[PDB]
Subunit: 280 residues, 4 copies
Amino acid sequence: EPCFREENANFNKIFLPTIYSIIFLTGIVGNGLVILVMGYQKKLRSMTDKYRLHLSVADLLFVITLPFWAVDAVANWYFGNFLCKAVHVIYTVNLYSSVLILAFISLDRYLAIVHATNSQRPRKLLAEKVVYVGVWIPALLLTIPDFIFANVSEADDRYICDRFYPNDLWVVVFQFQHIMVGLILPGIVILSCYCIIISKLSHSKGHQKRKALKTTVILILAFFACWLPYYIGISIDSFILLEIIKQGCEFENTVHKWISITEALAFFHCCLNPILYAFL
Amino acid sequence: EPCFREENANFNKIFLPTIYSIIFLTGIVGNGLVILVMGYQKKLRSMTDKYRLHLSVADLLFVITLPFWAVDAVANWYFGNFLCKAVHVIYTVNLYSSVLILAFISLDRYLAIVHATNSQRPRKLLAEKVVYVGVWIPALLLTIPDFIFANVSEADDRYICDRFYPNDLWVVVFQFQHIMVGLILPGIVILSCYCIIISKLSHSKGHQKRKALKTTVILILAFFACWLPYYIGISIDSFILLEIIKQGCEFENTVHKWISITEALAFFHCCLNPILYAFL
Amino acid sequence: EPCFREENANFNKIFLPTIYSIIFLTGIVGNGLVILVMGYQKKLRSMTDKYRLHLSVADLLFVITLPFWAVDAVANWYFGNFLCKAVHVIYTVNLYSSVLILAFISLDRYLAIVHATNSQRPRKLLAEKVVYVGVWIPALLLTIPDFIFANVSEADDRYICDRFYPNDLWVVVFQFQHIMVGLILPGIVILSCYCIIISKLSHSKGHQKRKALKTTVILILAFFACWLPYYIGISIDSFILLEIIKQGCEFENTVHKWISITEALAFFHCCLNPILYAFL
Amino acid sequence: EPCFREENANFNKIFLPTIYSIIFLTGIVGNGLVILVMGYQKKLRSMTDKYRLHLSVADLLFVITLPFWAVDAVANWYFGNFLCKAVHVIYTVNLYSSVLILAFISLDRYLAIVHATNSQRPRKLLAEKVVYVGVWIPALLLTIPDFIFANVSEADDRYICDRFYPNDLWVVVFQFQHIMVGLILPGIVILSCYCIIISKLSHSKGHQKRKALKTTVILILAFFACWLPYYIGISIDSFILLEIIKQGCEFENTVHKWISITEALAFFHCCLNPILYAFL
Ligand SMILES: CC(C)CCC[C@@H](C)[C@H]1CC[C@H]2[C@@H]3CC=C4C[C@@H](O)CC[C@]4(C)[C@H]3CC[C@]12C
Ligand SMILES: CC(C)CCC[C@@H](C)[C@H]1CC[C@H]2[C@@H]3CC=C4C[C@@H](O)CC[C@]4(C)[C@H]3CC[C@]12C
Ligand SMILES: CC(C)CCC[C@@H](C)[C@H]1CC[C@H]2[C@@H]3CC=C4C[C@@H](O)CC[C@]4(C)[C@H]3CC[C@]12C
Ligand SMILES: CC(C)CCC[C@@H](C)[C@H]1CC[C@H]2[C@@H]3CC=C4C[C@@H](O)CC[C@]4(C)[C@H]3CC[C@]12C
Ligand SMILES: CC(C)CCC[C@@H](C)[C@H]1CC[C@H]2[C@@H]3CC=C4C[C@@H](O)CC[C@]4(C)[C@H]3CC[C@]12C
Ligand SMILES: CC(C)CCC[C@@H](C)[C@H]1CC[C@H]2[C@@H]3CC=C4C[C@@H](O)CC[C@]4(C)[C@H]3CC[C@]12C
Ligand SMILES: CC(C)CCC[C@@H](C)[C@H]1CC[C@H]2[C@@H]3CC=C4C[C@@H](O)CC[C@]4(C)[C@H]3CC[C@]12C
Ligand SMILES: CC(C)CCC[C@@H](C)[C@H]1CC[C@H]2[C@@H]3CC=C4C[C@@H](O)CC[C@]4(C)[C@H]3CC[C@]12C
Ligand SMILES: CC(C)CCC[C@@H](C)[C@H]1CC[C@H]2[C@@H]3CC=C4C[C@@H](O)CC[C@]4(C)[C@H]3CC[C@]12C
Ligand SMILES: CC(C)CCC[C@@H](C)[C@H]1CC[C@H]2[C@@H]3CC=C4C[C@@H](O)CC[C@]4(C)[C@H]3CC[C@]12C
Ligand SMILES: CC(C)CCC[C@@H](C)[C@H]1CC[C@H]2[C@@H]3CC=C4C[C@@H](O)CC[C@]4(C)[C@H]3CC[C@]12C
Ligand SMILES: CC(C)CCC[C@@H](C)[C@H]1CC[C@H]2[C@@H]3CC=C4C[C@@H](O)CC[C@]4(C)[C@H]3CC[C@]12C
Ligand SMILES: CC(C)CCC[C@@H](C)[C@H]1CC[C@H]2[C@@H]3CC=C4C[C@@H](O)CC[C@]4(C)[C@H]3CC[C@]12C
Ligand SMILES: CC(C)CCC[C@@H](C)[C@H]1CC[C@H]2[C@@H]3CC=C4C[C@@H](O)CC[C@]4(C)[C@H]3CC[C@]12C
Ligand SMILES: CC(C)CCC[C@@H](C)[C@H]1CC[C@H]2[C@@H]3CC=C4C[C@@H](O)CC[C@]4(C)[C@H]3CC[C@]12C
Ligand SMILES: CC(C)CCC[C@@H](C)[C@H]1CC[C@H]2[C@@H]3CC=C4C[C@@H](O)CC[C@]4(C)[C@H]3CC[C@]12C
Ligand SMILES: CC(C)CCC[C@@H](C)[C@H]1CC[C@H]2[C@@H]3CC=C4C[C@@H](O)CC[C@]4(C)[C@H]3CC[C@]12C
Ligand SMILES: CC(C)CCC[C@@H](C)[C@H]1CC[C@H]2[C@@H]3CC=C4C[C@@H](O)CC[C@]4(C)[C@H]3CC[C@]12C
Ligand SMILES: CC(C)CCC[C@@H](C)[C@H]1CC[C@H]2[C@@H]3CC=C4C[C@@H](O)CC[C@]4(C)[C@H]3CC[C@]12C
Ligand SMILES: CC(C)CCC[C@@H](C)[C@H]1CC[C@H]2[C@@H]3CC=C4C[C@@H](O)CC[C@]4(C)[C@H]3CC[C@]12C
């Protein structure tokens, strides 16, 4: 039996737009400046800069989308139907593309350090062609469900832009797929690559070969640190869905609020990328 | 139908005076020392020092005004009528002068970096004459409404020093004007100048030409960061005024409290300026 | 008409002992090590070390006293009458001696910088003889009221070790005296000395003459920063006592809790001194 | 008369698993990498590395145990009886082994600094043989009570994996023993060794002999700082047990919540060790 009394808190209606607007401004300015400096001009000296440019493009699209999130968080979504689908589409594109870009950065680091003897053609070919196919096509393929399912439906004057499925089985399947492709699958690749790099990092002593990984590792740990609590919340909610953590109706509201605040902090990570790009 | 039950919380009556007193002490000491070192003696080597001196003068006047704010925040305003007008006048003068001084600093940086070939007479003339007219006269012109409208009126033993207008149309018009002249109009100029500087900052390599902007950019970002949440709150309240975010009487109190605390943190920025002047 | 319903919160009964115990350990270890290194051995190279040794002795005595505070904060004071007087005596001695030691440090800095031409005998004589008389005798003279007035009296099984006076006039007079001799009187001397030093610090350029003040100024600002909120709270309470801020019975409890927590943070400063002594 | 209404808060059921999962990931990765770099390869240049390897092994075992804690914190313990005993066994092993390893590090530092004249054979023999016996055997001997007493018992559908004793005398005796062997006994040894080192550290001037203690002292202070509040909470609870702090039924719940959160932060220390190992 579904519960009731689900509504947004008064403090949240003012706290969330502040976060969204700060992320709006910071992300737009930083990503635009990074794109202008890197792509338009000639500043790509290393191979990580191209992946960082892809990251900047995805983050710029998402932060452009954000003001609709900020407006919706206050009162409601009652300004169209196609805009809900569009917002969900860029959301999913950025969400599934940033992690794959990070995994490609880790793979490039592994190929550059472990097989430094003769590997420049593999790195170049992988970089160009595989980043295009591997990092983008799957993002669109996972946005495919967004076109079909995203919609806005009112329920006694309650207009919500929310993905709707005929049954809860679709809900749990898609949440588990989100977890698997967002955290577990690329996390294993990143961990394996960096562990092998660390094991092989026992030649001569500290040098540029040892200090070249600092920026990449800081970026990766920051990206995953701002995302972990949201993943924990959604995993707990999905477990509640399959009659495993049945504990009453007062747990679902708490986990939902956890999910919302942690989504806001993930968008904070989306802004945190160019900030890391500033310090150098 | 206007709501009721508007009163200050017991915790606020002790939290606000603490912030006001800390700002009192820090701002007075720092601004006085900066004025004494810079104006009275001969320590103006660069051109940013004169604008910083103007900023120090404005902040010193505001922090001198502050103890009346601290006294009012506790119980009430029942110690005159002309003092309310005076307090509002220096408040508005500082509020509309600091942003214009920052915009002039940004303009000077743009003229110094982009057109470094032959530009010293434009910088000197602009600095002196335009800072006087452009940065001050408009501040007084925007304090003009304060003389007319600021007043203290009791309502069943409720003495409030608050600007009063015949209709809410004046309220929304003046709030929108405050937003436009405080955040949007100078922010665009600052962003354009610094973006053009960044685009043109691609000659030779890192040097004093690249490290001269650090203090100015830190000052500007700090100034705007301590002000953004207050602007978000007032924008939301103004939207509530024009029957757009009608959501009940429990949202207005929350946004009012948001506005108060964020005003206190803005005064914290007013103190944060000389602190930035200390580290060097 | 005095109000009722005055009792300690359940969370406070566990929060306060934690702070007291942390301060116990840190202060005892740091002050003991500082005394052992400085007094017993020969490590006094400068003239600030002797004043710092006096500060260490006073702080060591206070932190030795602290566990009685920690025990009292939990349940009650029912383990004697002479111990209450003793605890109040060392409390007052440390409280009125630390500020005077800081003022003497500031005076020594002023004499060392402004009159560096011929001043070593004034500094030595002042240091020894005036620190003894000026910094100690007045502390005992202000502890004189503690012997007379400190006592423990039960009121329906409520044993409180609290200073008792026949009238509230004594209460307000002694609170105002505490404020005047704790913050205003030495603060003016410190501010005047450092302002004159800053005005006279315009010879040659940055050197040891400019970097010798860093530790002293950091110590002084930390000392006053951990104390300001408590002084604000007691000033507000004293004003409530003289029928000035009459606002109901719900303000006194809030200001009392403010006073308690801020006292704990002041003891945190008492521990913060040797920590500043560690970094160098 | 025992009280009632003991249950976990809804917010705790989501806050605790987040901490447990973060500690899971960070501890496993860091400790595994440290073990792989140090033990498997040849990177033990100093004598502190062996004790740090022992610490890493113990922390790795505990963080492996942790996911059962995370699962239990949500709903209940209803997935066995032998697993409760096992979890308690590794918990106690790590808890009583980390402090002894720290004490051995302090003893090695004392022997290396105070008796640097002729002491290499004592350090080697002590290191190997005494770390094995002294640091391990007692840990197992103190886990001996865990085998006997750890159990899961339901009480009206309340399955709790909790140590059970016939009387409260056993409870207070074992809590006092835990405090004595966890904080007081090794703390005295560490303090004595470091105080004697500081007293003897008055030869020549600052050098490697003075900078070799930084990492060890930082590790020790961090270890004890993340543990002190939990010890304060358990001491207060044990005092409540022996009819000393009888203050009602509303104090026990608060101290229990204090204990839980502080346990989580102690596990945070368990993760903080390899982080300290990263910065160098
Ligand atoms: C409050 C908001 C507007 C502040 C924005 C702060 C961030 C986003 C700004 C401040 C400093 C800026 C960076 C400063 C320097 C560089 C290095 C250059 O090679 C690329 C541009 C880049 C990377 C800028 C990106 C945008 C940037 C990071
Ligand atoms: C049809 C719907 C799904 C469109 C949404 C996806 C769009 C926004 C994506 C898909 C392919 C993407 C492009 C793929 C490759 C490049 C080249 C790179 O150097 C900069 C980014 C850029 C130019 C991307 C921009 C964003 C992009 C156009
Ligand atoms: C000065 C800057 C920060 C303003 C830009 C931030 C914008 C995007 C945010 C701040 C507060 C938000 C407003 C508050 C929420 C609503 C409710 C909706 O019924 C009308 C749109 C409206 C009124 C929002 C528009 C977007 C908004 C104004
Ligand atoms: C998800 C919500 C709670 C936001 C969390 C943001 C925090 C947890 C993230 C964002 C920025 C991150 C930090 C970015 C920079 C540094 C300094 C570097 O030398 C170590 C990593 C460290 C210390 C990161 C730790 C994790 C971090 C602090
Ligand atoms: C473990 C530490 C080091 C990282 C930070 C974890 C905790 C402290 C942070 C991360 C996410 C944060 C939570 C985000 C979501 C919620 C739920 C909401 O209803 C209250 C705020 C609250 C409760 C925040 C409390 C603090 C929080 C849980
Ligand atoms: C608690 C309160 C009183 C502390 C005040 C702290 C601030 C305001 C003080 C502490 C250090 C001081 C600065 C220290 C050094 C300089 C550099 C000199 O070229 C101008 C004076 C100036 C700029 C001082 C300004 C005031 C200052 C910034
Ligand atoms: C009539 C009412 C509005 C008066 C309020 C505005 C007053 C306080 C303002 C207006 C003009 C201002 C002056 C304009 C220019 C200078 C020169 C500069 O090197 C230091 C500040 C100083 C000296 C300003 C001090 C403050 C000032 C006198
Ligand atoms: C450290 C102190 C002395 C610096 C200045 C403190 C001031 C700002 C503090 C301390 C004394 C306090 C004031 C004393 C006088 C009054 C008048 C009364 O009707 C309202 C309370 C009020 C307004 C108090 C508010 C807070 C207050 C003004
Ligand atoms: C408005 C209320 C919440 C006060 C907010 C104050 C905060 C948000 C402001 C005040 C001081 C500011 C900081 C001042 C100094 C630094 C260090 C510099 O290297 C980067 C900018 C940074 C990091 C600023 C970030 C924004 C900042 C932290
Ligand atoms: C987005 C981050 C990085 C910058 C800080 C934004 C938030 C966390 C800060 C800035 C302004 C702060 C708020 C200022 C005003 C209010 C409303 C008041 O009723 C409760 C305090 C509260 C709620 C503060 C909570 C935290 C706050 C919102
Ligand atoms: C948790 C508790 C026990 C930690 C105690 C930390 C503080 C008090 C300890 C840690 C480092 C110690 C300092 C380290 C170095 C010095 C410099 C020497 O010339 C005098 C001793 C002195 C000044 C020590 C004083 C005590 C000290 C500051
Ligand atoms: C009778 C009551 C009030 C006694 C309480 C005050 C006692 C504890 C005070 C008063 C005089 C003080 C002494 C005065 C001078 C010195 C010399 C100095 O190099 C170290 C501290 C030392 C040794 C002080 C120790 C503490 C002291 C003995
Ligand atoms: C292990 C370390 C931290 C213990 C030392 C801290 C001591 C001083 C603190 C911690 C908690 C405090 C206890 C809690 C409060 C009471 C109530 C009183 O009716 C008996 C004394 C007693 C029981 C306190 C004794 C002092 C105490 C134990
Ligand atoms: C009274 C309660 C709230 C405790 C307050 C403690 C705070 C406010 C105090 C204690 C320690 C102090 C800091 C100690 C060290 C530094 C770093 C130095 O480069 C500038 C001063 C600064 C930044 C001090 C600021 C004030 C400070 C942060
Ligand atoms: C102004 C800033 C920079 C310095 C810190 C000031 C404020 C934020 C700090 C200093 C003292 C702190 C207060 C100490 C006393 C109280 C009263 C108690 O019932 C709740 C905790 C509370 C409310 C603390 C809240 C935060 C606090 C007021
Ligand atoms: C979010 C999680 C996965 C991040 C894990 C961060 C910590 C545990 C990682 C990040 C940096 C890593 C360290 C980086 C460098 C070294 C030095 C080498 O001589 C041993 C491995 C060691 C000691 C690594 C241990 C594990 C480590 C400390
Ligand atoms: C029977 C029960 C109690 C077993 C639980 C204790 C186990 C896990 C403990 C007891 C003895 C321990 C070993 C003792 C010594 C060493 C050698 C050292 O270089 C690495 C750790 C290692 C290899 C330990 C691993 C963990 C260990 C096997
Ligand atoms: C994506 C990563 C963070 C997941 C790994 C964290 C794991 C160990 C944590 C996160 C939340 C926890 C879940 C929440 C609590 C329960 C209740 C129990 O009735 C079933 C197990 C289950 C469902 C837990 C399994 C362990 C769990 C999933
Ligand atoms: C028990 C719960 C509250 C967790 C507490 C964690 C805090 C108190 C611990 C964990 C990490 C520790 C810090 C680790 C690193 C440093 C920097 C070093 O130069 C001084 C010690 C210092 C400053 C430690 C202070 C104590 C510390 C901050
Ligand atoms: C003394 C300072 C410097 C170190 C940190 C001590 C305090 C502030 C920290 C350490 C442990 C923390 C507490 C851990 C446990 C509890 C009890 C729970 O019901 C509320 C959270 C609360 C209340 C935390 C509040 C803050 C806390 C007490």
